[PDB]
Design a protein around this ligand. Structure first.
Ligand SMILES: Nc1ncnc2c1ncn2[C@@H]1O[C@H](COP(=O)(O)OP(=O)(O)NP(=O)(O)O)[C@@H](O)[C@H]1O
Ligand SMILES: Nc1ncnc2c1ncn2[C@@H]1O[C@H](COP(=O)(O)OP(=O)(O)NP(=O)(O)O)[C@@H](O)[C@H]1O
Ligand SMILES: NCCC[C@H](N)C(=O)O
Ligand SMILES: NCCC[C@H](N)C(=O)O
Ligand SMILES: [Cl-]
Ligand SMILES: [K+]
Ligand SMILES: [K+]
Ligand SMILES: [Mn+2]
Ligand SMILES: [Mn+2]
Ligand SMILES: [Mn+2]
Ligand SMILES: [Mn+2]
Lengths: 357, 357
């Protein structure tokens, strides 16, 4: 309870994992209780920032995360407006928030977090305050959300302000984060339910792929538009990995796939090059990563040990300035952006805000 | 001692392998000793049938085996003339035969066995009588050795008979064997030092390839000129496998391979399609073989345990009627055969013999 940035938050998988991470949860908890939630797999995460004045509720922005629920919103890349979420589903979300605002007695700013699994909208939480997304939203929308909510807090309704209709922008605005893993080498550069990033960037595009590509480049990525890609995905992702591989191939990448991931591609008509794990042969990935053999790496994991078992690729990839994704959705966006030219067109905030009708 | 067909013969890998097969070896030895011979790895096997009249030695034929030394002569396919052996080396063997014929006091037929390793002739054994290769060589050379040798035995010299020069036919002759593994399913259809074949066929061609293809077809092989091929080879064969894989590819085959093989092929630039062993996952080889996915199977093993590990490919390949090779040389030969038409041309023996000058 009473924490932001998911402080002391951890995905428990069993008995043990609990005893281990419970005290801590409590220590930061604030004489408030520790919630034990059930983990929604393959869920899309969503952030909603809104303003309620006791009369009305104004929808600031709906942001669809790239990375799935499980990866803190704070370490997630996000899109405004949504890039895959159905209108019907958004509308649902818009309603819930409203419901919440009022029930909550909200006055000023609020931020709501959801999860969309099998077309169902689940409630993650609500921050009865200004969230870290505001600036990004304000910038994307042209609507100085902090001002307004400030005004509201003071007595000047949204109506009196003349701010009542949710703004939907012409272009795509994508936020991407920057992680401090390079400062702390002894740390597993893996993402999760706890927030570890220090900053963020924003990409604006005609297309999601255009916005994404810009945010990525701005995030200081090392991603290349050619080369060899390494694909090492986890069981669940075994199905979509095939389509992502295809895109990479279409793009001119050559592929390598560790045992299990190759088995699947191949069974689908794609034959990657087999690569040996650390404990399998020589050369092994590490050698390969190290050799400046890859330009891209996609690696999904799942389970406390499987994670400590794959820690090496990540450390190496990070260590060798190789662009790497740890989420398949993340890989899909990375791929999509291959079809874009981050240095093609430049626009000003001014122009941006000018396109808004 | 005193056995033919490799009765009770076995390749031993350690002490205990030894203690397990020793008594059996003795039991069949005829109050004669058991030889312990160091195994000759990557060596070519050669058979030589000759007649000695105490005056002169007549070389009937030198047959080079397809399968290497270690696979019983009676279970190996063979070629007359030799198809890979240098003249220089064959000549070395012709002399050894003569030297032996004379020292041993041979009077009539004899059969000599050699192994070629590193351009070095090695003696395996001498069969002081007519051998199983006699009819084939006679048919191949047009010289009725049993008749000639019978006469020599009864008093008539080679000179007198006017059979004094070795015949080297204009065509290739290849012998192939038929194995009974299909009658005894609970058996691992592996080849070895002990003879298990029940019969043989003869293939005659303008080339080694033509000869082999004919031998292979008459041996009732299920081999196809297209399809998917399964490659699963041992460590030593890791070098020549590439060439083999390549050759299958140039022929239009589609490859599948297991882990290790796939690794090597990958390194060569060949990207087979990965296939799961039986302990690896699903579908696996067994499943795929069983499904009729394959038209050719090349599977080589090495060592008691590694043999017993791969037994299932062999047994399934058999049950499902897929052509399989258990030696790389075997595979290479098969490959060659791919470039020929066994149904193309036919020739009577009368006609073959007439082509001899
Ligand atoms: N039930 C759940 N299933 C899957 N993921 C979840 C679940 N609950 C939370 N998460 C993920 O874990 C993150 C952290 O949960 P949360 O309670 O929002 O932490 P927080 O510290 O309050 N964040 P914030 O106030 O925005 O700085 C969410 O952003 C989700 O990505
Ligand atoms: N040292 C060795 N290294 C490699 N292979 C060998 C060696 N000794 C024998 N072999 C193999 O073992 C087989 C059988 O040995 P061999 O002494 O010829 O048995 P055999 O019963 O007398 N045969 P046969 O009289 O021709 O029916 C040979 O054909 C070779 O394949
Ligand atoms: N949005 C967090 C950054 C993504 C990172 N490249 C990874 O795939 O983990
Ligand atoms: N001449 C021996 C038969 C070979 C069999 N196809 C296998 O390679 O074992
Ligand atoms: Cl580039
Ligand atoms: K997320
Ligand atoms: K042999
Ligand atoms: Mn919070
Ligand atoms: Mn949160
Ligand atoms: Mn013998
Ligand atoms: Mn022999």
């Amino acid at each position: 309870s009473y924490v932001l940035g998911g402080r002391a938050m951890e995905i428990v998988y069993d008995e043990a994992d609990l005893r281990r991470y419970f005290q801590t949860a409590v220590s930061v908890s604030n004489d408030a209780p520790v919630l034990l939630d059930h983990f929604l797999d393959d869920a899309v995460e969503v952030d909603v920032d809104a303003i309620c004045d006791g009369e009305m509720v104004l929808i600031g922005g709906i942001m669809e995360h790239i990375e799935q629920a499980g990866v803190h919103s704070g370490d997630s890349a996000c899109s405004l407006p949504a890039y895959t979420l159905s209108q019907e589903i958004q509308d649902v979300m818009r309603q819930q928030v409203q419901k919440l605002a009022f029930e909550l007695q909200v006055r000023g700013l609020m931020n709501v977090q959801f999860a969309v699994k099998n077309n169902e909208v689940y409630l993650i939480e609500v921050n009865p305050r200004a969230a870290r997304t505001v600036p990004f939203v304000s910038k994307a929308t042209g609507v100085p959300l902090a001002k307004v909510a400030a005004r509201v807090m003071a007595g000047k309704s949204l109506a009196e302000q003349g701010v009542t209709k949710e703004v939907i922008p012409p272009y795509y605005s994508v936020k991407e984060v920057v992680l401090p893993f390079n400062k702390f080498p002894g740390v597993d550069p893996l993402l999760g339910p706890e927030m570890r990033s220090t900053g963020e960037v924003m990409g604006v595009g005609r297309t999601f792929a255009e916005a994404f590509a810009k945010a990525q480049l701005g995030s200081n990525s090392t991603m290349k538009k050619h080369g060899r890609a390494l694909l090492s995905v986890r069981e669940g992702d075994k199905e979509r990995v095939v389509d992502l591989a295809a895109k990479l191939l279409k793009q001119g990448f050559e592929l390598d796939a560790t045992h299990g991931t190759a088995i699947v591609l191949g069974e689908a008509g794609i034959n990657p090059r087999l690569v040996n794990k650390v404990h399998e042969g020589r050369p092994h990935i590490q050698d390969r990563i190290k050799n400046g053999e890859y330009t891209y790496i996609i690696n999904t994991t799942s389970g406390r040990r499987a994670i400590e078992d794959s820690r090496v690729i990540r450390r190496s990839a990070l260590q060798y300035k190789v662009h790497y994704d740890t989420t398949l959705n993340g890989g899909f966006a990375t791929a999509m952006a291959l079809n874009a030219d981050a240095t093609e067109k430049v626009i000003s905030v001014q122009e941006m805000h000018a396109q808004i009708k």
